[model samples]
Target: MYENALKRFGLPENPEIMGEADIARYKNRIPETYLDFIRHAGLGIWKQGYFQFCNPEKYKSIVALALGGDKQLNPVRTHALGFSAFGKILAWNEDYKTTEINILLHRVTCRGLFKEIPAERSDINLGIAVEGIDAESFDAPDEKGKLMFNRLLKNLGKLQLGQIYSPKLHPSLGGQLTVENMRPVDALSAMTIAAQAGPFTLYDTTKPSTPAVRTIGSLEH
Candidate 1:
């Protein structure tokens, strides 16, 4: 499915659209809708919505609190926070179905600590970031009732830490997968929001991050 989509976009066979370079080339080549599909598709497993907390710096701070660990700690691992039915069918080959990564921002499951409670629409405070719009409609969970920024903000008001919810860069989120030379956004993204308010964390829990959530899937090991 994605192969055909990529063909339509005239993108290369195995275009790794991870950075600005690929995005630049993709500026006008493909329609934004399919491009979104490809973007999240490239990401792995995905679906309807996300917490989309927009603050990169806050995200950094958040990472520190949620996963901050010392050099002795192990590398932070990326997790498929929850499940979703929306995956990109690669068709890059016969078995080319690589589901992108998605994070579930429920107050539960995605346990992480926050330094301060964030308000809605704040830049580094998990605003709703929808990619494609009519420049009118919007990003994931574009539906009116579904884009729950306020809901998240409200839930956050009650949250403290990862059950242990301490502030000041929790040290649990600090590992190889996080706190590298990488920028905070890339770090969060690389770990697929490993340190965000409500995604999976490397050391947050013992539950492994694999398979999809919501709809169905799990890891054998």
Candidate 2:
């Protein structure tokens, strides 16, 4: 059903098909088009570790950590569909759109439909959700304007599921976007620490451009 959209990322590695029960669990919770893709594409890593198609259930903890206090995002309804090796999350928001959380930068990009469109026209929304996986979406560029995803992959090596290249000091906290400053860490914990320390900046890719700032967990005065 989504062959052209799947072609955008080329082939996925280690594709894992969803079990019938697991597929049923998400039936009406997320877009049906997504379930259709899951039925065909299953789940797997793509773009040489730049992105992944994951089981949302396993990432609930991280989702809460990242979006819990954001006024626009509801942690309970926003499901983490996948993520980048650098910890950028691709989520299916109950708001009828996809949201991207760039943990290192403490930024969230909200994209796609905000309200219900005609049912037949919504088929392409799944592809729109996948658009966040574009290379620029995952990498943090250095002072020299060099993108870091490949360098990190080569230096620290490929990440397994649930892991991401986490910075020792977050970029916003004065860390250099260099290979030496990062190492793979459990995605859940990395986001937990980041979100706790955050007042994340939220951006919406659709029209009106002013971004909003959101503080997640309690932080000291």
**Top candidate when judged by TM-score against the true structure:** 2
lDDT tens string, model 2, 136-211? 7577776678888888888888877667888787777788777788888987878778767856666545657544
Worst 10 residues of 2 by lDDT: 212-221
Model 2, TM vs. native: 0.82
Instruction: Give the alpha carbon lDDT tens digit for every residue of 38-109 in model 1.
Output: 455443212112211121222234323332342221113211111221110011000111112222222112
Every model's TM-score = 0.21, 0.82
RMSD of each: 17.0, 3.6
Instruction: Indicate which candidate wins on lDDT.
Output: 2
- CA-lDDT, candidates in order: 0.25, 0.73
